[PDB]
Write a protein that binds this ligand. Sequence first.
Ligand SMILES: OC[C@H]1C[C@@H](O)CN1c1ncnc2[nH]ccc12
Ligand SMILES: [Cl-]
Length: 167
Amino acid sequence: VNSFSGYLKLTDNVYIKNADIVEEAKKVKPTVVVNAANVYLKHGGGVAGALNKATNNAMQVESDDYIATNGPLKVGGSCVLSGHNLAKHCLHVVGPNVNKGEDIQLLKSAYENFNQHEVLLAPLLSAGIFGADPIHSLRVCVDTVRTNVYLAVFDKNLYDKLVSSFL
Ligand SMILES: OC[C@H]1C[C@@H](O)CN1c1ncnc2[nH]ccc12
Ligand SMILES: [Cl-]
């Protein structure tokens, strides 16, 4: 039993809700919140900009130190940093950004990072301003993640479309 509330069950391990991931994190304080990151951990907009804003820019400050020490992430890769006021940990995961010309086959690799954590509050990878097809991303999530994932989908129209089209 966990404290996630109001989620529609999709499969054995994947759940979905129409909510802002920031608000789900503020309410649940999950062990792991996933950020839809880029390789530079520049949290400018979308999920990343919203999460970072909710930390009063502390996520960005921590991220800049991480990059100064370690260099950029790989597309498809991840790192674990603090969850600040929102969660115990933040798993920064880089899905491909097709608006930047990055490669969509890397979406499965990106979701594989979730399997290192038993339970996660996560956004739909490569959705929104990353420019990928959200229906495809949900399919990759369900077919790749084996641990328990709670997907928070901010956009109501998208949530409705995702549920109604799920196979
Ligand atoms: O709607 C699903 C995706 C794609 C784009 O619409 C934004 N987005 C989010 N999902 C979950 N939490 C979020 N907080 C802020 C934005 C956001
Ligand atoms: Cl977005």
